[PDB]
Design a protein around this ligand. Sequence first.
Ligand SMILES: [Au+]
Lengths: 112, 110
Amino acid sequence: IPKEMLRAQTNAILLNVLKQGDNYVYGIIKQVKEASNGEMELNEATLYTIFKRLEKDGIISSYWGDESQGGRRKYYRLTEIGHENMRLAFESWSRVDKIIENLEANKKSEAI
Amino acid sequence: AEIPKEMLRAQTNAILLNVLKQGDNYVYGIIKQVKEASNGEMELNEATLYTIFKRLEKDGIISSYWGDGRRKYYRLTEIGHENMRLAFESWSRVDKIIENLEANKKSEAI
Ligand SMILES: [Au+]
């Protein structure tokens, strides 16, 4: 599995987890660990790197939590731009499957 | 907000490797079939293929040979086919992870 594809996957995951609600990193890693039957330990480093991009792009935003409790954790939130990105990713990928669909279709066409 | 470069590259590659999957081919031909399969809309630029093919050839995902004008055919390699398989399986496991996230969310909501 190429690293490019791994980080693309981690991205798909994070946008999705934040879709279901604002979260923090230790929490995000834990929920995916659970939702993948132990199998998927996300890499803190890759998360951090991704959040800098996604914060850059305004796909996510962040705020401080747990300050009332003596803490200072960082909560992330999917933005509207966030939801738009995910929509266009979906639509975009669906368009690609259709192009491939049509390639396979036209192949079987010439075979006739 | 727009679709980032990395996703664009990934998409273009998805398509090219898939054209190769369906049968070894030459570049004029590849671009023509995609033009057809995208209802006229997507006539790739040669240069984009060449850029991409250099990477893929580098990584051993594709290779090339002469056919008899004597065109240059590119072929998905075995490693090629393997990678596409594992990519598919891997991405399917990711849909399940997401599936399961949405499932656990609706669970706690109750
Ligand atoms: Au595939």
